[PDB]
Design a protein around this ligand. Sequence first.
Ligand code: V2W
Ligand code: V2W
Ligand code: CL
Ligand code: CL
Ligand code: CL
Ligand code: CL
Ligand code: MG
Ligand code: MG
Lengths: 226, 226, 7, 7
Amino acid sequence: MGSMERASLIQKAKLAEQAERYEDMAAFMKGAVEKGEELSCEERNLLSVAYKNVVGGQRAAWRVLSSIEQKSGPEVREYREKVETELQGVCDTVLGLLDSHLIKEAGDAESRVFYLKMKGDYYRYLAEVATGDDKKRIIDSARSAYQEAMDISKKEMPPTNPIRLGLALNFSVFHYEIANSPEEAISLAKTTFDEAMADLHTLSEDSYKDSTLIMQLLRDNLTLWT
Amino acid sequence: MGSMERASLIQKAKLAEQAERYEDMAAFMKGAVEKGEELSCEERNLLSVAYKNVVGGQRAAWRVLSSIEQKSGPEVREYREKVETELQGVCDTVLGLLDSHLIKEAGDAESRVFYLKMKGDYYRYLAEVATGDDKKRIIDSARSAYQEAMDISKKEMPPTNPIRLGLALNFSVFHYEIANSPEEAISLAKTTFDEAMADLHTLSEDSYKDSTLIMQLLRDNLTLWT
Amino acid sequence: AGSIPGR
Amino acid sequence: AGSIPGR
Ligand SMILES: *Cc1ccc(C(=O)NCc2ccc(OC)cc2)cc1
Ligand SMILES: *Cc1ccc(C(=O)NCc2ccc(OC)cc2)cc1
Ligand SMILES: [Cl-]
Ligand SMILES: [Cl-]
Ligand SMILES: [Cl-]
Ligand SMILES: [Cl-]
Ligand SMILES: [Mg+2]
Ligand SMILES: [Mg+2]
């Protein structure tokens, strides 16, 4: 996308989202990132939504195929491997954008925590399909990114901040689903929920809606886990 | 897909359908067609389902973008054009498979009518986005394919045959939406429905369900058009 | 106006 | 267990 203007890439990413063309959206946002300028709050959301939808489809397909494979020629394994490789390529692409050079230029809490949560998420997706000599290293890479994001968010953001809440939600899912630490997952979700509840009185009607929506997701997980 | 076995391509198309990976499904079925052998009833369905889903997504995206464009820089037009070109490429690919060499080798009514209905459908999708010196020629190409399929289906298939019913359904949609002939659309849908109703007594419980399901679609259209 | 679905 | 949605 080197020949397209940054503003045109952003405008087309928004159009692609409206058209539910998430692969296009992701390619446009990849082009925007590669222009080398920092991303605004809105632009970070476009980048994240695009790739989350792309990899979300790949994860769903991989789970269908992995399930068929476990029930069971080489075809099912071969095709699961093809989907798995494509998923890993997307995760590697996102991680490459974060590393070159989104994270190192992100100084504000809102951008730095957001990018590090992203980094934890895409290593988590890599961990979901990992089975070799590096599942452990991938899990530790996810944990380290989430942990750095938590530390910053606890120091710099109020307990109701939606980025702080969604980071804690996903880190708790990491604990439960990847790290085999359900007690840590439950403790984190419950402490996050309780500290947000105690801060809701400070919020406007619209911020209250933003925060309580994510608190409900924490509660939903706790209901499933307990 | 030249290096993959035909049977493996078919097996992977079925897996892709289960995983809702329709672009993969279509590429696998394209590879199977290019092996040069005729397609079975089941295989024809896989080919049709794959491409119908792919182009169905492109049509939905094109309509979103065309609507934004009509409400309104060059970005919206440029992106609608990109989606439009990709859609035309898929239609041309399917039409190329029918022409090389599915239709010329199809001698049985069930295969020949099915492929010609397909040919009418993909020219119809080309007509939906056509605006130049060839919208008329594309519309006539769609009409001619549908007409040849109708003539064969009236001579060779009972009025309840699901292929005959779905052909008449889509040809009626062609009349209404493309050819600006709503009276022809309504007449065709109503005569098709009535002649199927009169043949239902001949059918088994399962064939009755197959036919009445498509008759309901004809009725739904008539309710919308009258 | 609906056309025919595959499945 | 649900993770965070984008929108
Ligand atoms: C890291 C991060 C991404 C997105 C959000 C957010 O606010 N998403 C909107 C949303 C929240 C909850 C919900 O429940 C149904 C739906 C959408 C926060 C943090
Ligand atoms: C050309 C052609 C394609 C497919 C069929 C068919 O039988 N599709 C299954 C189906 C019929 C009706 C329906 O209504 C909801 C859903 C699925 C026939 C002819
Ligand atoms: Cl494969
Ligand atoms: Cl900075
Ligand atoms: Cl474009
Ligand atoms: Cl033949
Ligand atoms: Mg510039
Ligand atoms: Mg062979």
